[PDB]
């Protein structure tokens, strides 16, 4: 059940995987609204994976621990500062969280892509699994795949004013199980922006 991946020019296939878990669509919604005067121009060279280190659960962890990374975050290289030279830019997202199970860890970690989340009161974390989610247990599958299309106002978004998405890696499994396995398994999330668009460019300072 090896899973292939590809975006732009870089790719890393998971040795074992569960399979993609789509959300809220199968493909992006209509792209050039009659509101934005059609100045949109698709950009191809801007979707490449970019590693980004996240919190790693250790034994001390209570179920309640939650963690949310503001998406999208500061980018360097191709697709880095592109948002700056454009406004009302839109993109779907292909997140990918990878962790090392050790084939010996009882604890189960669940990650859900959520839109416009506000800090929770720790009482909805239970029902959090409503949004698109795929949730991993190092027994079977050490990585999860999630692709969402953007949802918020349909025509465009200003990523400097309001982020419309977030990662939430809350650990569903109580604590962690040290059953002859690595004590701390840091989780890595290979965020991957797919199918961007852009609109009216800022006056540069170059």
């Amino acid at each position, epitope marked *: 059940r090896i899973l292939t991946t590809r975006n732009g020019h870089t790719t890393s296939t998971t040795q074992s995987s569960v399979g993609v878990t789509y959300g809220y669509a199968t493909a992006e919604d209509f792209v050039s609204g009659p509101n934005t005067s059609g100045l949109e121009t698709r950009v191809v060279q801007a979707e490449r994976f970019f590693k980004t*280190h*996240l919190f790693d659960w250790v*034994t001390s962890d*209570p179920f309640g*621990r939650c*963690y949310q*990374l503001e998406l999208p975050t500061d980018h360097k290289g191709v697709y880095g500062s592109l948002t700056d030279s454009y406004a009302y830019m839109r993109n779907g997202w292909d997140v990918e969280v990878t962790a090392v199970g050790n084939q010996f860890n009882g604890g189960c970690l669940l990650v859900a892509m959520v839109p416009e989340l506000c800090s929770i009161d720790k009482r909805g974390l239970y029902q959090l699994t409503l949004f698109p989610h795929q949730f991993i247990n190092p027994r079977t599958n050490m990585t999860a795949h999630i692709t969402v299309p953007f949802v918020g106002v349909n025509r465009y978004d200003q990523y400097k004013v309001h982020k419309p998405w977030t990662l939430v890696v809350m650990v569903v499994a109580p604590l962690t199980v040290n059953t002859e396995g*690595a*004590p*701390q398994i840091k989780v890595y999330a290979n965020i991957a922006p797919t199918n961007v668009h852009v609109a009216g460019e800022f006056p540069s300072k170059e």
Partner: antibody, heavy 109, light 85 residues
Framework: SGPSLVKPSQTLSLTCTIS????????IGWVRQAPGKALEWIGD???????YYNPALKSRLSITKHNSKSQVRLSVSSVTPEDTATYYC??????????????????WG | ITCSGT?????????VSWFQQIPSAPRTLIY???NRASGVPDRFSGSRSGHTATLTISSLQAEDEADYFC??????????FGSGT
């Protein structure tokens, strides 16, 4: 709670170990703290014989894991004059060893 | 009080609470995200924010000497980092 020695190259020994309660079912930790400098957890002990020291000081550092007399003897060789700091018998509730030093963690505090 | 602190070091899923009553044991089991260990529960209670901000207590008068320490687990360099005060 002593600054030990700096000039001697011998491994620092801090057997502040008293049987208030045992090391039998609990965790015990070791911290470096100078008059003023950054604080590092030299090491710690949890039931299961799985104690891990800090990554930066990995080879030169070692803590004795004996349950008799509820003792703990630091085994740190190649000690440099800059290892001038006060250490403390530090106690945690259980399974807080993880791999490297953690505190500020909830339900672990 | 507050310390100077990157978001990724303690901000992305970290806990800061480290308490001392130095004048001389810095080892007082004492914490700030929560008010357990029995000692110093009232008027010394703190909390942490969405990014570096550090415990707060009741104002306009001071009933403790020197000042307190802050400790945060740091993800970049596996060794624990603690300083400032």
């Amino acid at each position: 709670s002593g600054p030990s020695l700096v000039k001697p190259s011998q491994t620092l020994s801090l057997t502040c170990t008293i049987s208030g309660f045992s090391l039998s079912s609990y965790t015990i930790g070791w911290v470096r703290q100078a008059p003023g400098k950054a604080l590092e957890w030299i090491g710690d002990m949890s039931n299961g014989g799985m104690p891990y020291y800090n990554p930066a000081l990995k080879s030169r550092l070692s803590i004795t894991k004996h349950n008799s007399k509820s003792q703990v003897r630091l085994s740190v060789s190649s000690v440099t004059p800059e290892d001038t700091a006060t250490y403390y018998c530090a106690k945690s509730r259980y399974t807080g060893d993880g791999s490297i030093g953690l505190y500020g963690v909830d339900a672990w505090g | 009080i507050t310390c100077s602190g990157t978001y990724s070091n303690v901000g992305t899923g970290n806990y800061v609470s480290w308490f001392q009553q130095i004048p001389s044991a810095p080892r007082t089991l004492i914490y700030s995200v929560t008010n357990r260990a029995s000692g110093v529960p009232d008027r010394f209670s703190g909390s942490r924010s969405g990014h570096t901000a550090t415990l707060t207590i009741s104002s306009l008068q001071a009933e403790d000497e020197a000042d307190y320490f802050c400790l945060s687990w740091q993800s970049g360099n596996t060794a624990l980092f603690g300083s400032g005060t």
